[PDB]
Design a protein around this ligand. Structure first.
Ligand code: CL
Ligand code: CL
Ligand code: CL
Ligand code: CL
Ligand code: CL
Ligand code: CL
Length: 318
């Protein structure tokens, strides 16, 4: 069974969580058909989505909303999740007490599933999850000890084997909690392993709609970590998932003819250029951000699920 009962307390003051939430042309507290966008590591909401799902979700009839947890999604993934939980509580009420879809890139999907696993109050407020290149198992390519003995807190947590990914898995988080679509690529240069088209893949959730692009488009089809978010193929799958009556993308809605790895057709020329350039801010932000030589401690609500792991303060104990 999943964690149940009360939501964990926020470590951040709520006013700080509110400051990280924005909607385009609307207040989060009075918004029609919001979609909550959760960005990837090293980026803000606008940096992740200005070139793709902010305009694309608008043209599908949603009000694009996003969180930008400081600094650039580099802090503790457990803190980034508080931004999302507060945003769901706010947007649910602000939209007339209606469930809303959540759309994510990279760590944003890990954040979404962490929130669903450990904050039971939001399960009934999230309609569906559309995750592009989510690293629910982390990645073996993270290299928190690569080129420098200190790395951002969330880089430690997204390393395969981390206490965080261990606790997510042991608490039941690798099975979908709301209707979920995961779109990912075997050629992802940031998140691996993704090659098996099976539960071994970091983006795979049991009972989710798990769409490895090469399983539809062929073994030699190439989209990278950013293209998993921005490509025309990704748009067709994401549009399917958002419109589906089941809450998940439908195999009937996309096919080999949608296997275009370039930025979504409906983007402006300036958006397509920006979409192709995606990753660079969120490679550089690392440089100027918080860095440490250990994985952040697990919050008490998650510690029983990673017994035997090791974090900054010592051995994980319940
Ligand atoms: Cl507070
Ligand atoms: Cl605005
Ligand atoms: Cl922002
Ligand atoms: Cl990462
Ligand atoms: Cl189309
Ligand atoms: Cl550690």
């Amino acid at each position: 069974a999943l964690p149940s009962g009360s939501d964990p307390a926020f470590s951040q003051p709520k006013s700080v969580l509110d400051a990280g939430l924005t909607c385009q042309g609307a207040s989060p507290s009075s918004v029609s058909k919001p979609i909550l966008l959760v960005p990837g590591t090293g980026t803000t909401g606008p940096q992740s989505f200005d070139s793709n799902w902010i305009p694309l979700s608008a043209q599908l009839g949603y009000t694009p909303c996003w969180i930008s947890p400081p600094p650039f999604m580099l802090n503790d993934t457990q803190v980034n999740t508080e931004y999302m939980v507060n945003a769901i509580t706010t947007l649910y009420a602000g939209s007339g007490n209606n469930k809303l879809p959540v759309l994510t890139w990279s760590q944003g999907g890990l954040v979404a599933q962490w929130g669903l696993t450990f904050f039971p109050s939001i399960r009934s407020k999230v309609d569906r999850l559309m995750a592009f290149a989510p690293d629910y198992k982390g990645t073996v390519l993270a290299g928190p000890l690569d080129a420098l003995a200190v790395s951002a807190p969330s880089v430690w947590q997204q390393t395969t084997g981390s206490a965080l990914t261990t606790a997510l898995r042991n608490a039941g988080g690798l099975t979908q909690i709301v209707p979920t679509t995961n779109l990912y690529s075997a050629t992802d240069e940031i998140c691996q392993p993704q090659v098996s088209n099976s539960p071994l893949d970091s983006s795979y959730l049991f009972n989710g709609k798990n769409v490895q692009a090469q399983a539809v488009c062929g073994p030699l089809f190439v989209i990278d970590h950013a293209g998993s978010l921005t490509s025309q193929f990704s748009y067709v799958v994401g549009r399917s998932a958002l419109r589906s009556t089941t809450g998940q993308a439908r195999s009937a809605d996309y096919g080999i003819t949608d296997c275009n790895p370039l930025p979504a057709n409906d983007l402006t020329p300036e958006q397509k250029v920006a979409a192709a350039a995606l990753l660079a801010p969120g490679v550089a932000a690392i440089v100027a951000g918080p860095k440490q030589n250990c994985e952040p401690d697990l919050m008490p609500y998650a510690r029983p699920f990673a017994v035997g792991k090791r974090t900054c303060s010592g051995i994980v104990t319940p």
